[PDB]
UniProtKB/Swiss-Prot annotation, chain A:
Coiled coil: none annotated. Residues 47-57 have a biased composition (Polar residues). GO terms for biological process: translation. Keywords: Ribonucleoprotein, Ribosomal protein. GO terms for cellular component: cytosolic large ribosomal subunit. Residues 1-41 have a biased composition (Basic residues). It comes from Mycolicibacterium smegmatis (strain ATCC 700084 / mc(2)155) (Mycobacterium smegmatis). This is Large ribosomal subunit protein bL35. Residues 1-63 are annotated as: Disordered. The gene is rpmI. PANTHER family: 54S RIBOSOMAL PROTEIN BL35M (PTHR33343), LARGE RIBOSOMAL SUBUNIT PROTEIN BL35M (PTHR33343:SF1). Signal peptide: none annotated. It comes from the Bacteria. Belongs to the bacterial ribosomal protein bL35 family. GO terms for molecular function: structural constituent of ribosome.
Curated annotation (Swiss-Prot), chain B:
HAMAP family: Ribosomal_bL27. Belongs to the bacterial ribosomal protein bL27 family. The keyword Ribosomal protein applies. It comes from the Bacteria. It comes from Mycolicibacterium smegmatis (strain ATCC 700084 / mc(2)155) (Mycobacterium smegmatis). The lineage of its organism: Bacteria, Bacillati, Actinomycetota, Actinomycetes, Mycobacteriales. Keywords: Ribonucleoprotein, Ribosomal protein. PROSITE patterns: RIBOSOMAL_L27 (PS00831). The keyword Ribosomal protein applies. GO terms for biological process: translation. One of its GO terms (molecular function) is structural constituent of ribosome. Pfam families: Ribosomal_L27 (PF01016). GO terms for cellular component: cytosolic large ribosomal subunit. This is Large ribosomal subunit protein bL27.
From Swiss-Prot, chain C:
Belongs to the bacterial ribosomal protein bL33 family. GO terms for molecular function: structural constituent of ribosome. GO terms for cellular component: cytoplasm; ribonucleoprotein complex; ribosome. It comes from Mycolicibacterium smegmatis (strain ATCC 700084 / mc(2)155). PROSITE patterns: RIBOSOMAL_L33. InterPro entries: Ribosomal_bL33, Ribosomal_bL33_CS, Ribosomal_bL33_sf, Ribosomal_zn-bd. One of its GO terms (biological process) is translation. It comes from the Bacteria. This is Large ribosomal subunit protein bL33A. PANTHER family: 50S RIBOSOMAL PROTEIN L33, CHLOROPLASTIC, LARGE RIBOSOMAL SUBUNIT PROTEIN BL33C.
Length: 63, 79, 49
RNA sequence: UCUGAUCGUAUUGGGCCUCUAACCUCGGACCGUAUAUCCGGUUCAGGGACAGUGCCUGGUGGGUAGUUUAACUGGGGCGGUUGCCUCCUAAAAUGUAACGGAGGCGCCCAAAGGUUCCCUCAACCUGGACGGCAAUCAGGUGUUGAGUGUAAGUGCACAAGGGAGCUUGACUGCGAGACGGACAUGUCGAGCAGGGACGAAAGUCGGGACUAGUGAUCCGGCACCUCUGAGUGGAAGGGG
RNA sequence: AAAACACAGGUCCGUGCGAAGUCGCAAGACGAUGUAUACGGACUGACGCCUGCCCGGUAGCGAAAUUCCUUGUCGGGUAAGUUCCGACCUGCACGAAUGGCGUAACGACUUCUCAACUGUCUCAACCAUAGACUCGGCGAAAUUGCACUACGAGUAAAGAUGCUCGUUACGCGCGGCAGGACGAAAAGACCCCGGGACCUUCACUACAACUUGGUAUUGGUGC
RNA sequence: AAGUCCAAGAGUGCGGCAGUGAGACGGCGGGGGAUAAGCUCCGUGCGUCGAGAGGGAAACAGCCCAGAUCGCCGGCUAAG
RNA sequence: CUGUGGGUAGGGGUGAAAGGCCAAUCAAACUCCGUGAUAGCUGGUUCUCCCCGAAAUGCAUUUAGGUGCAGCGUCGCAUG
RNA sequence: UGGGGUGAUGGCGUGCCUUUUGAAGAAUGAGCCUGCGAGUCAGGGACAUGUCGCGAGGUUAACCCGGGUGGGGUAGCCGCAGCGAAAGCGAGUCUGAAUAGGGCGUAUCCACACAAGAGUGUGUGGUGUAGUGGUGUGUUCUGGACCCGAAGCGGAGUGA
RNA sequence: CUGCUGUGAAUCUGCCGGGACCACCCGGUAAGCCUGAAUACUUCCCAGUGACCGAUAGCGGAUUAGUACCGUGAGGGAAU
RNA sequence: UAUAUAGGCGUCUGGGGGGAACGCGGGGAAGUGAAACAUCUCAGUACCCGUAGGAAGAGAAAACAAAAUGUGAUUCCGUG
């Protein structure tokens, strides 16, 4: 039985060239009128997964 | 028969973050505060929420001007 | 309501560039105000949609 | 082919009334059949283009079924609470619990945002018809009192408080550096475009005195895009 | 085992007949070889009573049998008397124009008072039998971490044979008692938490049980 | 600045493979309670027990002394 | 009241109705199978020694006796 | 120096397990003995730790042949690159109307220059980067998944 | 691609598919069609094999074994 | 009745049933997981029904592909 990858984790996380798992940031989907553009710029782009969550996110991506 | 209390906001973890003599980088937050308990001194800016941050690299110093406590950055001699 | 999330769109580029609150009671008419259209690359008049 | 009525041939989908031929009748007779309240067939009688059972479709539906019906909690229930902000508890860094002590919330402001400039009374007297605990007011000092979008720490006659102009820092769109706080949250230097003020004078000032005024993801919209386009000369069918 | 169910009587509703209603997907069946004086369902539960100016008006009656009655007051019943029985009681009341009151008979129904009777008791004594007990034969059981398993006052998971300090106690039985071994028994039924089940419903969502369109199905004319 | 000097079995980062997320009492600073509880809830580079034997507290997890590598017909002491 | 022979079968039967009875079992009988149901809950989990050695906290949680992450235990890096 | 028992008497001495803050506990389990009774196996599964082969390569799956464990089998897989949502280059790329300003990548480490003290960059040269297949053990994935235990749910039947 | 219900296409200038459509096109010729061998499994029989069990194991069954026994029955089901 | 049919009668050839697995067609759960639960999962599984054959349909492309000198009757295996 092949280890199935977690669909949600695969859709929410990516690995860079060096293997860094990257993710997008929450609170940037709607309710944006009250959010200053500095906040949305902070929430923009991709950030490396926190070391605490890295183990479980790797588990979900690999199997 | 119950209590009307029980609410409280999160502690905002205010206060001095870099004390006197600490070498800081430009843009480093020196004081998280409500209002100007400390005022921006030399090479120190004041944030929108009253956060005092270093404008230039150097060592944190606390001074007094016109009876108001201020946070200054003293430039550190290059080695 | 009361203070709807109005959308300020430019007059020239006609791009819905900004979203901001406005008290409909104090300012019932469409909020015409000078803002920056990135498509136009300059400040242009924006008005409420 | 319009400014373009007007009538006529077939078709046409409904409604009233109809007769029969579908269909129906546990109404009769006969027959298969010697046995037969079955069944089927024939015929008559009656429904008789009337009603019906499939497919589709609304509605009612504890009749039946699968389920849900939170937690905290000085047991549980009852009551109360649940998120965010402020204070005290909190033991002078930070943080710190209780169904501990108090409150706020979750909005509001296009002029209460930006900039530039300027200010100036908290209470006694003389008084100031009316107008004393108050007027429009005038002086003095009260020395920084006093009061001041909404509770603590701040801001003062170095004004974050009070007035005025601009015409829209209502400073927005691209934002190294640093940082403070697990995600989330929060701070700003600074560089560029475009502007706003102040201009002589400098070149200076990134929503609100600051912390609450909010809700992840999913899924869907709506505008724009130099993206995609399930063979494509190509488009329609997803993304940013 | 009852005050509950049923019951005979009553009322309401449904059903015009392969009725309704039920068992079935259907056919079919029961209903019923019955036909509104009959069947089914619902609810009451013999039998008797329960209308006041107009039942043209305020409008459901104001009497009575109506006992929550705590009604106290008083008595009857006991020396002290519960159940209960009476008058006085209780005010817009209060609960029944049909659901409340009566009701002979009946009752292993609930409660009480009598007469009689008695070992129920004052208050126990004695007799017999079956056990128990003794002997012979056969011969289990639950339980069991152990063991040459005391008491006191303490201490300890806060109630000690096992620990402390003392007190007592020669070893082993037999017949008895049942205070403890938080004795045995049943992984507490109570309470809480998690799950389940079944039940209810104006919780959610479904499904079984009926109407609309056109299929089956469709001809003209009087229209 | 040094000190800890055959390092603390130190701190940090990254991968270990975890369990733990019921704590208890005692001392100090407090909340609730009646400034009761062997109460309850916090703080304490505070301790101990948990997970800790040994000695003293008569017995007596949490107090006091003291952290058991093993033996010994040895010695000195801790609290008592 | 009874004998004999029959009929009604499980979300069903039967019930003068007690959730009563339906093979000593009934708020949904029993047998087999799905099946080794599932259980954040109890219980059990078996040889040794050497080194190290916790936690009972924070945040979140249909969460509070569960769990995720962090804190705290266990080899190689850098560090002296 | 020795070498086994039996234990008057004295000192000390509160079963084992589980579960707990804490049990000798009057909390759980065990009457006793013997035997049995619980982290196992599958898979090119996933993540981490010695060996073959490289030299950028490792490997084969099905399958074919072999009387075996051997020989073939390149399909594919993983390395070989990245940035982007994609179109685009290449150690570059994406965001960017703005040779304006940043993230992710160009193993790593040396030296020499130019910019820098906002703490380090930009070039230039030099070493040339190490993944992969078996089997190593520990975790983990899907399976009952360390073992035991419900009440109950469903299907098909058996019972008056 | 396909079930049911309704409505319903000509003859190659047709029709269908390429995950709409002019079509640049390509592929193929359904419904009237029908029809082949070459891969799974083992009740049974034969010959074998085992870093399988060895009488509480291994099949429930080395022995009366689906027997005794239990149950009305389905069914459960040994010991030796 | 119209017989020009259903039925009746003779004869002949076949079917009934069983079988462990495998096949095809059809009906089709719930334990369970989603840490609740209804979508979903469990799972087209268990079970059931009808039917074979030694094996079981299609089948000789209304096929795929993508501008390629493309593959070319059908099924199973490995990859993808």
């Amino acid at each position: 039985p092949k280890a199935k990858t977690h669909s949600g984790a695969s859709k929410r996380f990516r690995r860079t060239g060096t293997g860094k798992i990257v993710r997008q940031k929450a609170n940037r989907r709607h309710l944006l009128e009250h959010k200053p553009t500095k906040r949305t710029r902070r929430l923009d782009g991709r950030t490396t997964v926190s070391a605490a969550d890295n183990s479980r996110i790797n588990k979900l991506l690999n199997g | 028969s119950s209590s009307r209390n029980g609410r409280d906001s999160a502690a905002q973890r205010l206060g001095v973050k870099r004390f006197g003599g600490q070498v800081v980088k430009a843009g480093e937050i020196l004081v998280r505060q409500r209002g100007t308990h400390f005022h921006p001194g030399v090479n120190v800016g004041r944030g929108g929420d009253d956060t005092l941050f270093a404008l230039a690299p150097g060592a944190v110093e606390f001074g007094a001007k016109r009876g108001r406590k201020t946070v200054n950055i003293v430039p550190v001699a290059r080695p | 309501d009361v203070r709807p999330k109005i959308t300020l769109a430019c007059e020239v580029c006609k791009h819905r560039n900004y979203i901001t609150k406005k008290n409909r009671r104090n300012d019932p008419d469409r909020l015409e105000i000078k803002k920056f259209c990135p498509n136009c690359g300059t400040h242009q008049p924006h008005k409420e949609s």
